[PDB]
Amino acid sequence: HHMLRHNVPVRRDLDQIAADNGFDFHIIDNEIYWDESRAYRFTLRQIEEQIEKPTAELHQMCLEVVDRAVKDEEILTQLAIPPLYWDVIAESWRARDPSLYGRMDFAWCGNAPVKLLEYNADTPTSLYESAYFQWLWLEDARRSGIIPRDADQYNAIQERLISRFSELYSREPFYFCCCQDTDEDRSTVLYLQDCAQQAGQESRFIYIEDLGLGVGGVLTDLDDNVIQRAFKLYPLEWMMRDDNGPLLRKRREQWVEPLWKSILSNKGLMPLLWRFFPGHPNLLASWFDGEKPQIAAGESYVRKPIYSREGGNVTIFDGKNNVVDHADGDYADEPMIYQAFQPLPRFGDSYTLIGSWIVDDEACGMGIREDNTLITKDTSRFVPHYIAG
Numbered sequence: 001h002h003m004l005r006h007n008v009p010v011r012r013d014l015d016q017i018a019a020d021n022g023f024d025f026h027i028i029d030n031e032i033y034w035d036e037s038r039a040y041r042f043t044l045r046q047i048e049e050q051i052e053k054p055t056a057e058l059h060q061m062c063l064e065v066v067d068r069a070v071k072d073e074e075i076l077t078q079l080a081i082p083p084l085y086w087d088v089i090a091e092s093w094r095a096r097d098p099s100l101y102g103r104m105d106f107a108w109c110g111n112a113p114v115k116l117l118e119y120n121a122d123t124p125t126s127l128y129e130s131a132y133f134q135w136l137w138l139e140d141a142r143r144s145g146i147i148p149r150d151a152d153q154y155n156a157i158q159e160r161l162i163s164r165f166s167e168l169y170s171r172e173p174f175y176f177c178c179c180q181d182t183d184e185d186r187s188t189v190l191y192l193q194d195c196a197q198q199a200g201q202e203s204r205f206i207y208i209e210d211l212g213l214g215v216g217g218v219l220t221d222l223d224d225n226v227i228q229r230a231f232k233l234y235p236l237e238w239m240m241r242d243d244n245g246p247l248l249r250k251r252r253e254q255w256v257e258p259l260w261k262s263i264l265s266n267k268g269l270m271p272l273l274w275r276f277f278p279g280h281p282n283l284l285a286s287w288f289d290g291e292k293p294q295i296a297a298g299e300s301y302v303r304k305p306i307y308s309r310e311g312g313n314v315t316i317f318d319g320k321n322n323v324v325d326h327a328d329g330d331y332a333d334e335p336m337i338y339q340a341f342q343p344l345p346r347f348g349d350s351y352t353l354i355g356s357w358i359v360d361d362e363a364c365g366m367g368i369r370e371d372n373t374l375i376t377k378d379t380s381r382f383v384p385h386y387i388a389g
């Protein structure tokens, strides 16, 4: 009973639905992004046994990596974390600064275990699509009969987000920030803000570019109010490269995601998982650039940056060391890791990637991306899925 994809009719009023629900990036410069012309059908057993339980287990494995890495300067060095920040990252972990969310990327292997490619443990997007828009799609699809009436979906993300913001409630305003000139980032953060407000959390939005510093480096908003806690859709590694990075050592602001997530939002995680859990069914052999390769001669392999996103500067090599595929990106100068190669599955002419969501520590949903090559990148489309049987 294999997982499959099938065509489905696009809703005749899709553009109106997107507009009415704040989905202002379902089309991106006149290219389809949200793609409901097809859908993936999983069984409940595939969800529970191959996606949900392994995601939860992998997150526990990642927390063990954090606990070991904060104690080991050689590991922190391999992770390319600047030594200025080792103490504050270690303290962030020791205080167990609260986490909100993270998203793993998986290569689907049919009846075999999924393979973990990376852990977007800091600033994952495709959240609005995964938590909200595809659930509305499911409700419409069940009633129009294009999928079974009793179809489900692997998706409790919104409920877990709201409940997590409830656990983190403070009388102090919770700031939300992202950079300018990206509707996707703004709407991802707006969605999180909406979830926080549904839990009773007073929330304020400010652009990263509008953040100010008062005397002595106190973080302030545009009205010179002191910012005590903020969610930032902005990479931890960029915060630590910023000229104002050293201010993080004072721990005067609460950040979500917290500083200890810098160990996980880091492709150096993949060699560390392979080191500490060799042979785990969901892991691929992986090593830092310069270490002895952990594949045999002839096998294909992947090189990718430690810090990157959206497929930037991924190279797939064959076992004669020729380039199989390569993606442009702004990360050409970052240090690199290697990983054994597991091609994404191909459906029609698209290559399919599973993003599996964690909220705090709970596996609670998934969203699918399709793209035209083996390397998921900036042209990828989001595709709904459902559960049947």
Ligand SMILES: Nc1ncnc2c1ncn2[C@@H]1O[C@H](COP(=O)(O)OP(=O)(O)O)[C@@H](O)[C@H]1O
Pocket (backbone or CB within 6 Å): 105, 107, 117, 118, 284, 302, 304, 308, 309, 310, 311, 312, 314, 339, 340, 341, 342, 343, 344, 353, 374, 375, 376
């Ligand atoms: N070990 C691998 N085997 C096969 N494909 C890979 C591997 N690692 C990455 N890829 C491809 O490259 C894409 C991007 O890699 P990923 O680790 O998700 O980094 P990011 O999305 O942060 O650039 C993946 O979605 C997949 O298409």
Ligand SMILES: [Mg+2]
Pocket (backbone or CB within 6 Å): 105, 118, 310, 311
């Ligand atoms: Mg990815």
Ligand SMILES: [Mg+2]
Pocket (backbone or CB within 6 Å): 118, 119, 120, 308, 309, 310
């Ligand atoms: Mg990524």
